């Protein structure tokens, strides 16, 4: 309908900027049926939004059903299957949660690294620690990122000690070379006492340095960093762009 | 128009030329765009010599390479690529006096591929006595932000003269100036090089996984689509552009 297409873009830009998610939505409904399939993304983030105000009054059965709106939109959306997780969780059905959250595996493996602070949280009080050991070894191995690595090299270092950590982080420090995972040396640093270790902790500072400097995550529209996570890019303004930065720089 | 329509079927021809190595059918059709106004097309004539150059140099013609060379500096005063294989051709001749002089063109032509000269630069001049001035264009070229290949070879001229504690102060200052793994690799040796007994061991092992990320990490990136190479290419196997694949800037690279 020439024109009103653009009218209709500029509302749901607008509408964005003011947080007008409900009315977001209308717009981006008619763009959908009007042939602008790339909205059905935005459509389950605005839900996600509304849902998020929704917890603000503890409304959070009213904020489960914002989410299932959502997913309708996008059977994708990783944040709808994380925020459904948060859920599940804060109403202790900690099995649900597993259920959603192990969604992200197939929906975008790029974010799998999210959901591991949760799901470690929902192994452990569902009393499934050694099966949480066996989800972090199988997501190490298919390159979940320095972040599972170090999950994982935390709970050998308690189950096997500090010496079969060490031998452990070297062999997949080769497999998957990270600076992260290389800082972890301290493993190396817990012995050799001359000369040389007033040699080794100036590297490892200088390795440090870097660790905490070095941002996390990157929009793959333009090129924004951050250290946390963004679905929404301060920058361009674009929806599940920025995802972790995967290399030696990063994870 | 009838032109428009006619430089429509050139760009064809072009590309189905292009796509089948034909340089010098190429520069024919390339040559009528730039006749009917499409000058950046100049760009793309410098590289077709620069292919028959390069087919020239692999029968050790030099004198024929180095006229299509000549050819290709006439299309594009700006193309780096000519400057380099001009180096080739002049130190295959024993010419190193000239060799210099177009390699070091790559400055102004394109600063980010002075790194590609630097090895050729540094054989010119210790052939001509001038290991001297060689130290004092490093120094420039460290301060003009080279990369991690001056920043190391200045570091084992630094060591020629001063040895260690010397050139390594200047590398500690150069790496954090400008952090890479590359120059934090050199910066490993120089801690366990005069300095054993259970430490040095436990610092080999490291050095070794970081020298072992440098030498098979690729170092160039096509620009204009992000594909990595080994080599670089100046035609980019992936989106067929030329004069895009750079070497990789940082940590990861120089
Ligand atoms: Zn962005
Ligand atoms: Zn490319």
Redesign the interface.
Request: charged residues 20%; proline residues 4%.
């Given at each position: 309908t020439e024109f009103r297409v653009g009218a209709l873009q500029q509302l749901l830009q607008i509408y964005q900027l003011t947080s007008d998610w409900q009315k977001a939505i209308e717009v981006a409904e008619r763009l959908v049926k009007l042939g602008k399939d790339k909205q059905r993304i935005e459509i389950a983030h605005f839900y996600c939004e509304l849902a998020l105000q929704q917890m603000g009054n503890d409304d959070m059965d009213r904020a489960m059903a914002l989410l299932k709106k959502g997913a309708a939109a996008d059977k994708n959306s990783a944040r709808v299957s994380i925020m459904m997780g948060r859920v599940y969780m804060a109403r202790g059905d900690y099995a649900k949660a597993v259920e959603s959250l192990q969604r992200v595996i197939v929906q975008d493996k790029e974010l799998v690294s999210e959901t591991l602070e949760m799901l470690q949280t929902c192994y452990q009080q569902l009393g499934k620690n050694a099966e949480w050991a066996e989800f972090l070894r199988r997501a190490v191995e298919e390159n979940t990122g320095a972040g599972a690595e170090l999950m994982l090299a935390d709970i050998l270092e308690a189950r096997e000690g500090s010496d079969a950590a060490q031998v452990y982080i070297t062999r997949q420090?080769?497999r998957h070379?990270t600076?992260r995972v290389?800082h972890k040396?301290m493993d190396?640093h817990l012995?050799?006492?001359?000369?040389?270790?007033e040699?080794?902790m100036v590297?490892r500072d200088?390795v440090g340095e870097?660790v905490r400097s070095?941002p996390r995550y990157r929009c793959q529209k333009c090129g924004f960093t951050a250290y946390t996570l963004y679905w929404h890019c301060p920058s361009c303004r674009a929806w599940s762009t920025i995802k972790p930065i995967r290399?030696?720089?990063g994870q």
């Open positions: 420090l080769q070379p600076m290389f040396l190396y012995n050799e006492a001359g000369r040389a270790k040699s080794l590297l200088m870097q070095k290399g030696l720089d």
